[PDB]
């Protein structure tokens, strides 16, 4: 997270770390949506241009973490992957469209003060909050600058940007399954997700029921925190039906 700050303990209990066994390293960010389901970006698992195509056994999910590199004894829980499900229409060829994936854990994770699921938005929640200017929150253990690594989970609050502005900031073709966030050059404030943060959650706290909802998944960006550029996010609600069906098909 570029220009973020250290997370408070228990501030993001749904934060999950996609961790590679060999060599042991951070692969991506992710989120806890139930005791057996973790949500992340499809590109974290499958991304041919970067020679990425992990199988369940290559991965480990670390939940309840705060510190980046330290094994948090008596706090974090490390789960194994039973199955990986990538959106059947995720398009890594043209533009990372429908960049979403579900990972079912081998056995249910126990909730605690540091482990708790975030909500997925319903049509109405999405309609009211997914508006230009409304701020969401991005968290992760990714790079602090485009060109080090944090000691602790980082967090930054970023405003949703008008679609025309998002489109006019890049040569990439934006789809409806994406939204962008971040400050404009004249807005003064800054911050953005960066390498190591992708797959992570973009959440918003509904002022209607005071619950946190995951509106986006860190998907792509051109550099990190560059003036005139914005972080792009998978529109979670637009692809919820796929989520529901997977969870009600192979789910538990």
């Amino acid at each position: 997270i570029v220009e973020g700050s250290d997370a408070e303990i228990g501030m993001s209990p749904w934060q999950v770390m996609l961790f590679r066994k060999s060599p042991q390293e951070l692969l991506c960010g992710a989120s806890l949506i139930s005791d057996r389901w973790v949500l992340t970006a499809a590109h974290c698992l499958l991304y041919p241009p970067w020679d990425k195509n992990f199988t369940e056994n290559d991965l480990l999910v670390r939940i309840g973490k705060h510190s980046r590199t330290r094994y948090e004894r008596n706090i974090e829980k490390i789960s194994m992957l039973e199955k990986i499900y990538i959106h059947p229409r995720y398009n890594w060829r043209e533009n990372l469209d429908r960049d979403i994936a579900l990972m079912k854990l081998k056995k249910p994770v126990a909730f605690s003060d540091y482990i708790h699921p975030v909500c997925l938005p319903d049509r109405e929640t999405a309609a009211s909050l997914l508006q230009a200017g409304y701020k969401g929150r991005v968290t992760g253990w990714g790079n602090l600058k485009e060109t080090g690594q944090p000691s602790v989970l980082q967090v930054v609050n970023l405003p949703i940007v008008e679609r025309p502005v998002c489109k006019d900031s890049t040569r990439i073709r934006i789809t409806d399954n994406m939204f962008c966030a971040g400050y404009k050059p004249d807005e003064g404030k800054r911050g953005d997700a960066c390498e190591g943060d992708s797959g992570g959650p973009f959440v918003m706290k509904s002022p209607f029921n005071n619950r946190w909802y995951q509106m986006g998944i860190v998907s792509w960006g051109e550099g990190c925190d560059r003036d005139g550029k914005y972080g792009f996010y998978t529109h979670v609600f637009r692809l919820k039906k796929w989520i529901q069906k997977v969870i009600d098909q192979f789910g538990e």
Binding site: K21, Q24, E25, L26, L60, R62, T69, R70, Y71, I78, M80
Partner: peptide
Amino acid sequence: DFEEIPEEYL
């Protein structure tokens, strides 16, 4: 610089 995690998960 990742600290060794219980070999039990590997």
